[PDB]
Structure 1
Amino acid sequence: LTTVRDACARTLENTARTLHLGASGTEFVAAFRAMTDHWGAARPHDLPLSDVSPDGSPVEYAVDLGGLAPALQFAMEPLTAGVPARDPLAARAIMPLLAGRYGADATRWSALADRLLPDDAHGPHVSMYGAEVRAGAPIRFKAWFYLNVTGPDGAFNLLYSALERMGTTHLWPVVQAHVHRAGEDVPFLLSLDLSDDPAARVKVYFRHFAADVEEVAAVLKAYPGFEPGEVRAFCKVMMGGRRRFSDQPAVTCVSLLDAQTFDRTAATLYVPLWTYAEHDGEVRQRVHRTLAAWPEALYRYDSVLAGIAHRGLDAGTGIHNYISWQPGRTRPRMKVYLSPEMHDVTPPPL
């Protein structure tokens, strides 16, 4: 009888406690509640299926795999029981809430929302929001917009128009340079850090459809730190030795300003995990291989996973959604993105 908003808040709270986030964790859970209060008393079966997780869960949890002071993050979808996910009302309410209660910056959001959050979106989803926190640091909020709201062939037009509205068309060459597999490398999400602070970024997510690992390693080789050998190795290990993204595509995220400057790293590679393995136990084995040099990162990973999984890992896939890879100062930064399997049900035998 537990509601979605309470179930997710409890999972987030337990994960925060596992990561020893302290007071920062408590305030983070309160921000999650602020953002998901509007889900009402809905149970899982009352909400529309969400785009946040491939299994339709309306929340996804992500944790840093390495480093002291791990970050914890969530993404969610504004949703209302009985209302299609593409309806923009819930998403339009999140920004004034974050601006008013947390001092989030709405100026870039407001410049984009009229066109990217329209009343009659073409695609099935129109908005996600998220937050992240580390112990002792302020919570950072973000929004994702869909580049398909005017149909499939409008993503580049919509993206260029968004940069124009934000006064950053000087960033467009970053997008063009990331354009290798024309037609196959496609921007499909735009994210905004909802801060004014100097670190806030606009990011573009690209899909690499029908690519093998070497080709993906070429798109990324242009970004500092993306050593093709290390990138290929990460993909091959996390895909169980597969050399090509057969069905589910590779995804990259490009921080436009950081790709144009020098001091910050500007791209992130996302490897999908639920279709290239027999079950989440095999995915876990690949993470342990990948993190073998850091037994503490693995203990942390296992602790977070155990608090989010509620069935045996070997039963199938659906808990691990993605693992991401970014170059770091001394070591790569990896994150794991996990689903609560909100909608799964197991009836008794007939």
Structure 2
Amino acid sequence: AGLSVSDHLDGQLARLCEVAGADPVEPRNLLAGLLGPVGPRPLYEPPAWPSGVSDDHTPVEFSIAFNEAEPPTLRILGETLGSPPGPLANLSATRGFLDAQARRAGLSTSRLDSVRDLFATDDPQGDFAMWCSLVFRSSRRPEFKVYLNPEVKGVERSPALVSEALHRLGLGASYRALLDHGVRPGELGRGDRLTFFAVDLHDGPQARVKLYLTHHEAEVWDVTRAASVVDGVDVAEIEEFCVVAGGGTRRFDGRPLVGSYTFTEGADRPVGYSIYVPIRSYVTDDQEARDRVAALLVRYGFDTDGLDRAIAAVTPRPLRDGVGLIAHVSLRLGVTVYLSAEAYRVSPPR
């Protein structure tokens, strides 16, 4: 037959697993589950639905996280499209996949369950309600993360939705620090958007949430001021990261900078921060993006062999021949590289 989406993505994952030394059986089984009805869909058919997961609407994005003294972590972000694809049908299918995997792995989901009704709506707003992250490592069983849309009941309701969800979980003080002292003056739900509310599927020993903010048309000065509410972050290091990844850009007026905040029990400041540069918006092509990411990995004492092998695993195409393979690069206070499936489109060089 013609190639399917599964044919393309399953091959990418199999090769990425070898690069990371992760066992491929369970990851490839989980990707097939996550794809649902998209898996068998021919590549020569247009996307089943305009998924926001990736620019070409492939409903999956790969990433490789380089960790100080630990083998790289491979992750898949994506969603399961519904039977007639659509916002509510996609939520049902994605939650169906996750709930089946919770049951299979014997996970407790009481923390996630405790906030379900705050996100639940018959008329979900925006291009998703729930995404899935699958997390793979050498010598660990896969981990599941759930990405909820804070704007699912509309952008206006997002701050109150997040406030009430964090209060229920026994969090809220670090979040209060971010809303009162970490958001650009007069920009909440405007320039500063609540983009993801991310939790482990499995109840951990303590409540933990990763909140992602999108900083529209933002100065690095303002994004690092937002970051400065986090314990022990170096604003200089974040700016250095942004200068290298952005090629000298100070105003990210293309695709926006994104920050994530890790909220934990008993803390009044976030305990973790990541900056996500959408590097595809600030380069001519993937050769230039690869060169910038390699410079960042070298500065951090990482091996560029892992990066080049992960790139080659995803696609053999000349890096000069397009842009957006390297979709994002992020600094965690290690370095994470986000690699596009390009199942539908290779964005041309710019």
Aligned twin of 1:105: 108
Query: Could you say which residue in structure 2 is the equivalent of 1:33?
Result: 32
Q: Is the 2:174–2:268 contact (alpha carbons within 8 Å) kept by the matching residues of 1?
A: no
Assess, with a 3 A threshold, how the Cα gap between structure 1 residues 166 and 228 changes in structure 2: closer, same or farther. closer
The answer as to 2:274 corresponding to 1:268 is yes
Q: Aligned runs of 1:1-350 on 2, under 5 Å?
A: 1-21=2-22, 23=23, 25-44=24-43, 45-67=46-68, 68-80=70-82, 82-87=84-89, 88-170=91-173, 172-176=175-179, 177-183=181-187, 184-198=191-205, 201-257=208-264, 260=267, 265-293=271-299, 297-327=303-333, 333-344=334-345
1:293: Cα distance to partner? Answer: 4.3
Q: Which amino acid aligns with 2:336?
A: K
Counterpart of 2:162 in 1: which secondary structure?
Answer: helix
| Structure with greater strand percent | 2
Equivalents in 1 of 2:95, 2:216: separation in Å? 31
Matched pairs, number: 338
SS of residue matched to 1:83:
coil
TM-score, with structure 1 as normaliser: 0.88
Farther-moved stretch of structure 1 (169-178 vs 272-281) = 169-178
Q: Distance in 2 between matches of 1:163 and 1:86?
A: 24
For 1:236-287, what per-residue CA distance to the aligned partner results, in whole angstroms no more than 9, with x for missing partners? Answer: 010111111112211011111179279x941111111111111111111111
- Any unmatched runs of 5+ in structure 2? none
TM-score by length of 2: 0.88
Is the 8 Å Cα contact of residues 60 and 340 (structure 1) preserved in structure 2? yes
Q: Give 1:73 deviation, angstroms.
A: 0.7
Q: Answer whether contact 1:39 1:80 (CA < 8 A) is retained.
A: no
Partner of 2:280, secondary structure, is coil
In 2 relative to 1, CA 55–273 (structure 1 residues): closer, same or farther, beyond 3 Å? farther
Structure 2 Cα separation of the partners of residues 308 and 235 of structure 1? 25
For the residues of structure 2 that align with 1:187 and 1:290, how far apart are their CA atoms?
28
1:112 to partner: Cα distance = 2.9
Residue 86 of structure 1 and its aligned partner are, at CA, apart by 4.5
Distance 1:244 1:100 in 2: 46
Q: 1:259 to 1:307 in 2, by over 3 A?
A: farther
Question: Bigger CA drift: 222-231 or 143-152?
Answer: 222-231
CA distance in 2, matches of 1:240, 1:157: 37
- Tell me how far 1:109 sits from its aligned partner: 2.6
1:225 and 1:259, CA in 2 relative to 1: closer, same or farther beyond 3 A? Answer: farther
Residue 153 of structure 1 aligns to a residue in which SS?
Answer: coil
- Could you say what the CA RMSD is over the residues aligned between the two structures, in angstroms? 2.5
CA contact (8 A) 2:19 2:310 kept: yes
Whether contact under 8 Å (2:198, 2:210) holds in the other structure is yes
CA distance in 2, matches of 1:296, 1:324: 14
Residues in 1 aligned to 2:106 and 2:143: alpha-carbon distance in whole angstroms: 10
The verdict on how the C-alpha distance between 1:91 and 1:175 changes in structure 2, with shifts beyond 3 A counting, is farther
Of 8-17 and 159-168, the range deviating more from structure 2: 159-168
What SS does the corresponding residue of 2:133 show, helix, strand or coil?
strand
Residue 162 (structure 1) shift: 1.8
How far does the alpha carbon of each residue in 1:3-35 deviate from its partner, in whole angstroms, 9 at most, with x for none? 2234322211111012222x3x43222233333
Q: 1:261 to 1:139 in 2, by over 3 A?
A: farther
Kindly state the Cα deviation for residue 117 of structure 1 after the two structures are TM-superposed: 4.1
How far is 1:38 from its partner? 4.5
State the AA in 2 paired with 1:163.
L
CA distance in 1: counterparts of 2:304 and 2:266, whole angstroms: 31
